[PDB]
Design a protein around this ligand. Structure first.
Ligand SMILES: NC(=O)c1ccc[n+]([C@@H]2O[C@H](COP(=O)([O-])OP(=O)(O)OC[C@H]3O[C@@H](n4cnc5c(N)ncnc54)[C@H](OP(=O)(O)O)[C@@H]3O)[C@@H](O)[C@H]2O)c1
Ligand SMILES: O=C(O)Cc1nn(Cc2nc3cc(C(F)(F)F)ccc3s2)c(=O)c2ccccc12
Length: 315
């Protein structure tokens, strides 16, 4: 099926379009094409600095009556320099105004770590360490709950939270809404069995990011593994008469995950949605799972000293 039921009683499309690194002069086209081609979920964030252009696309397709707003599932994230209680609603409203929406279907705390507020997204000290904010995840979550109670967002969630930080929220005193989603990195080199089982056992839907290994990540290094070029993954693809990306997108779908491949290439945007007509076998799934290397696209090492840095813990 195309959607998964969230614990807020809404349905989330299991395939969405990613927008991190999508250039502001190509992302309007990319989102139009995606909607034309069937996508109903767009993954956004203020920190991606292109929400305005994404919004233009959404608006035009609504205007054109290609889609209705209820059919869309639009997701954004609160950036780290806005975890202070007084900053969350305006952060959300900026996103709404940029995307030209009057509500978000899902709004996530982008990272468990709060940073010092200001103009700077990664405020640094004279040793290039990120400057923390004294906020904690629990008060931040309480501020996300108010957005639900004010009608600005239909559901709230988390991203890059480890199982202990998920547990902190579920066990938060006076918790009012549980997280609907945990959005984490997940692909055959970072399979996440443990964190995924934890979350699903609690009725928290997991969204897999960087499902293709983020080949356009800005810090790519030569000896880094490459999913797209992995001969073993290519062989499974060939066996199924599909592309490697198709296998890499279909792979988290069969784990009951949501997946958001990024592309600005219209041929790829199309290709990437054509993943509902074939099935990986259990052997394929276990074989893909066997490629785990605990390799992360996204683990910015200048945050390692943050108290809430999520990746020291095993899972
Ligand atoms: N929560 C967070 O912390 C977080 C972190 C990272 C990512 N995310 C989200 O997850 C989305 C996906 O992750 P990602 O952007 O890191 O990377 P990704 O989706 O794994 O890979 C995107 C790269 O793959 C290429 N590509 C797309 N389809 C392809 C295909 N069929 N064949 C060959 N290459 C293809 C794209 O090229 P072109 O664009 O040139 O076609 C781009 O260079 C992001 O865009 C963002 O929405 C969230
Ligand atoms: O975030 C995006 O979606 C993609 C993303 N990932 N990363 C790697 C990161 N690693 C982190 C680690 C922590 C930490 F929690 F661990 F402290 C906190 C924050 C980050 S950002 C980036 O540095 C980044 C920079 C600009 C725009 C998007 C991103």
């Amino acid at each position: 099926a195309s959607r998964i039921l969230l614990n807020n009683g809404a349905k989330m499309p299991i395939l969405g379009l990613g927008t991190w690194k999508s250039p502001p002069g190509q992302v309007t086209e990319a989102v139009k094409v995606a909607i034309d081609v069937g996508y109903r979920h767009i993954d956004c964030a203020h920190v991606y600095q292109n929400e305005n252009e994404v919004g233009v696309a959404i608006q035009e397709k609504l205007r054109e009556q290609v889609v209705k707003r209820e059919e869309l599932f639009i997701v954004s994230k609160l950036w780290c320099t806005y975890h202070e209680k007084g900053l969350v609603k305006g952060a959300c409203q900026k996103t709404l105004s940029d995307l030209k929406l009057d509500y978000l279907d899902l709004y996530l705390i982008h990272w468990p770590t709060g940073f010092k507020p200001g103009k700077e997204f990664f405020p640094l000290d004279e040793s290039g360490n990120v400057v923390p904010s004294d906020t904690n995840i629990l008060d931040t979550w309480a501020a996300m709950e108010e957005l639900v109670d004010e009608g600005l967002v239909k559901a709230i969630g988390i991203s890059n939270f480890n199982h202990l930080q998920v547990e902190m929220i579920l066990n938060k005193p006076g918790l009012k809404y549980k997280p609907a989603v945990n959005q984490i990195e997940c692909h055959p080199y970072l399979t996440q069995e443990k964190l995924i089982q934890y979350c699903q056992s609690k009725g928290i839907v997991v969204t897999a990011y960087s499902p293709l290994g983020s080949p356009d990540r800005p810090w790519a290094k030569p000896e880094d593994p490459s999913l797209l070029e992995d001969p073993r993954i290519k062989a499974i693809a060939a066996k199924h008469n599909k592309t490697t990306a198709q296998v890499l997108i279909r792979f988290p779908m069969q784990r009951n995950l949501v997946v958001i491949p990024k592309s600005v290439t219209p041929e790829r945007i199309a290709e990437n949605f054509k993943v509902f007509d074939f099935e990986l076998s259990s052997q394929d799934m276990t074989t893909l799972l066997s490629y785990n290397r605990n390799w992360r696209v996204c683990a910015l090492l200048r945050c390692t000293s943050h108290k809430d840095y999520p990746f020291h813990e095993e899972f």
